Design a protein around this nucleic acid. Structure first.
Lengths: 80, 95, 95, 95, 86, 97, 103, 95
DNA sequence: CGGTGCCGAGGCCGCTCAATTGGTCGTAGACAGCTCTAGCACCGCTTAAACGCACGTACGCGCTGTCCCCCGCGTTTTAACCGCCAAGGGGATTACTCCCTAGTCTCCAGGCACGTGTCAGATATATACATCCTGT
DNA sequence: ACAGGATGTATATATCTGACACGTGCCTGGAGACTAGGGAGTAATCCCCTTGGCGGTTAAAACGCGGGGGACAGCGCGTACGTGCGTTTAAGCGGTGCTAGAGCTGTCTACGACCAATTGAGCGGCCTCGGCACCG
């Protein structure tokens, strides 16, 4: 169990259930593991760069909102 | 500790204007606050860009009106520019 | 019983609610592991990792809905990795 | 002591919007007092539209408070605001 | 003194033209019902871009649409285009 | 003598891919641009460079759409594109109708 | 008696970049002296990468003059430059790309 | 008639630096000019946004460096920040 | 459809700092006037491309086994969740001070339209070779 | 399974002309010199929110078994798009001319920036109570 493997099969299954997927194959688990890893990597690079600019060592919520705001995937509900 | 600027009171006031009895959760209030800040930021940025395009330096009502005719889609923009002209006329035709 | 009914039950149930689907602690461990590379010994506000979880869940939901459209295009009812890769290619993230 | 916001017959703090627009400009950027009331009216109309849709959805669900789920429902329900707001509502949900 | 209220110019994008476009696009074979729908999508794309450019040039108080304004309109739609004005 | 059906298509693929020049007749496209410009505001004139740039962006967007629909159809185990492929690709990208 | 570009050993106008950055900086904002130098260096390196790629592309076609087709080929050839320039090249065309089931 | 600002001469100079014999068409020169203006506009906008985030008012080299670490992807950004530090050190370590 | 509990949210103070009105100025735009570059409208000529159509042949769509494989349940087993306690790193202030950058004056030189004289690349043409299409 | 054999493509040369790199005269925005003030760098101090850990506790993961279902080769056929042919049109070019709106330029004025004395509304606490979140 690597640290990526926390995103397990029933979690991704329920996620696809929210999207309306009726039936899932086998390799989708590995596929979405890789995809979500890529996406979180892309966000967290920007968040760490913001925080390192601000001379802080704590990734606050405001910088996560900023990083999502820059990447065309803005998110409300946290101020900014 | 220093107070932070918000918009919550004005959202509450306009809500009570349109709906006299209903309420709004605090989390939804924060959502609306962020949404107001986002829309106003987009309008201000677009107006600044337009003023820099036309080689002018004073953002009057005209560039703001063009910004809402730009960002918002059709009939929403029409209602918006109507309310904008109505408000600015009520402002100007006063003391 | 029969296969094909509990699925639709899950569709209804997990679209009625709005609570978090990915469980919090393994996701937070994943976030800490990923941030371990781009800098050393970070710290995270709980609100920040909550926001990251919310955004990632919304993104995965959107991707699954789109790849479901892609799969139902090919007359199947089961998605496949080529469908997800096709959806991400069409959006253009190419990652 | 006439409170210019009421001189426009509006709720939004037109002085605060004025000093907000005062900063996000070009090098020697100036804003016109006629523009602040216009942006205030734009924000007031947009908030009124979103909040009345959310309140209609709330009275559909028979709840005095407006939850973010109501905001998600109202935004994705009417096509116009969804076409304007491409954002992701925190804790909102799907359709 | 304007004349010539235009009509039927949506048929200007003729069938061999769209054929040539898709040939550049990397399409091998084309079913005959494509032409109407690609005429439609071309119509709506030009509608949005021309609308934004017209709003620009009307803001500058001009009776004609310069190229720089079309480039600006394409910039605001995420499809910015180099070569002409910026 | 006659070619095999499809070989001429691949010849034209190579030809119209390695070329660069524009692909829609200039005057009909300009007439169409003015026709769409009519209802938004009357008595409009156009710089020739402006219509040129509109043609460039138009052909670019259509080429991207056609390539993406070809990706969709080749995923769909066919060779001929179809209007539902175009509608699917636009629905994925973010546009709608 | 020296210019700031040669003072830093660059090739982009430090004064012009400084005036532009002063012209787009949140009216009551100020612009540091070194920041213009940094921005000029950044733009210089980006142009260096794109122009070197264009030259390497044109050299394989035996043309001493760089054309927009060469710009588009050089940009879409590399991956990360393609990730940067998301725009459209006027008259650049597309890259020769043929898929699997097209035979 | 009033002259217009451009970048063509500097593009020609850096081209002759990297490639001593080749040439560039005028249309390609205009393309590169527009591309330079676009990249510089993106960097300036991002630096202004970052300075407004951190409640500061003087865009030094730090916010610019963060802007290029933001916009450009990985190894290109690494080469860029290396050349930036090298140039600013050559500037500072002078008369 | 009522019961009980919960604290989230709505209404009520103290206060302090941001609107606000009054007075000045000066600079930015409004506007009238004048030019003239460039866009619109014919006219004619050529001709390449659109267009109609006649076959036919690749192939899109549908139907049929069919075997992998994916969903549903059942049991265990495991690691998340809640609650609570502890230490302290770092976030968030205030308070100096001085480094740095906004200005102004003077100056001139790198930079920008303008011309022009050379030539690099488009175009054409005539060779020297790939390359599909039946086929013994 | 290469043998003809039209049918398209390297390739070298010839031309040719518009494009462009380089040389000018000119000329405002960059540089250098100085001064002022104020933004932030650093320094210190407080406190809080973050990490760490423990212990129960219990819903969710997780193998595993089984049974139906659907993904998919494989045929098979029956519309339809490619590949031509001849035929017609309007795209393009080149001119030719007409005029009007883009672009400067010079005045004039007006409105917004700036400064200050004032005061009230917007926010931090804070109380409190009833709208909702569950439960026969």
């Amino acid at each position: 169990r690597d640290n990526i493997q926390g995103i397990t099969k029933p979690a991704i299954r329920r996620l696809a259930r929210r999207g309306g997927v009726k039936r899932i194959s086998g390799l989708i688990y590995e596929e979405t593991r890789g995809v979500l890893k890529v996406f979180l990597e892309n966000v967290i690079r920007d968040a760490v760069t913001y925080t390192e600019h601000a001379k802080r060592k704590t990734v606050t919520a405001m910088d996560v909102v900023y990083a999502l705001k820059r990447q065309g995937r803005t998110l409300y509900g946290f101020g900014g | 500790k220093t107070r932070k600027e918000s918009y919550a009171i004005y959202v509450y006031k306009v809500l009570k204007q349109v709906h006299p009895d209903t309420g709004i959760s605090s989390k939804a209030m924060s959502i609306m606050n962020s949404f107001v800040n986002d829309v106003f930021e987009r309008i201000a940025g677009e107006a600044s860009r337009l003023a820099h395009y036309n080689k002018r330096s004073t953002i009057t009502s005209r560039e703001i009106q063009t910004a809402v005719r730009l960002l918002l889609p059709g009939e929403l923009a029409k209602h918006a520019v109507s309310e904008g002209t109505k408000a600015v006329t009520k402002y100007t035709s006063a003391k | 019983y029969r296969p094909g009914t509990v699925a639709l039950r899950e569709i209804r149930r997990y679209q009625k609610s709005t609570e978090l689907l990915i469980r919090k602690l393994p996701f937070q461990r994943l976030v800490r592991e990923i941030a371990q590379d781009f800098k050393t010994d970070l710290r995270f506000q709980s609100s920040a990792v909550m926001a990251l979880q919310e955004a990632s869940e919304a993104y995965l939901v959107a991707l699954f809905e789109d790849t479901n459209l892609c799969a139902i295009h090919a007359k199947r009812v089961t998605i496949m990795p080529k469908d997800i890769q096709l959806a991400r290619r069409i959006r253009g993230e190419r990652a | 002591a006439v409170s210019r916001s009421q001189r426009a017959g509006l709720q939004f703090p037109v002085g605060r919007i004025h000093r907000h627009l005062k900063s996000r400009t070009t090098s020697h950027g100036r804003v016109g007092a006629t523009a602040a009331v216009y942006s205030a009216a734009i924000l007031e109309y947009l908030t009124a539209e979103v909040l009345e849709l959310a309140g209609n959805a709330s009275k559909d669900l028979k709840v005095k408070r407006i939850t973010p789920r109501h905001l998600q429902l109202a935004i994705r329900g009417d096509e116009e605001l969804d076409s304007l707001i491409k954002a992701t509502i925190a804790g909102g949900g799907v359709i």
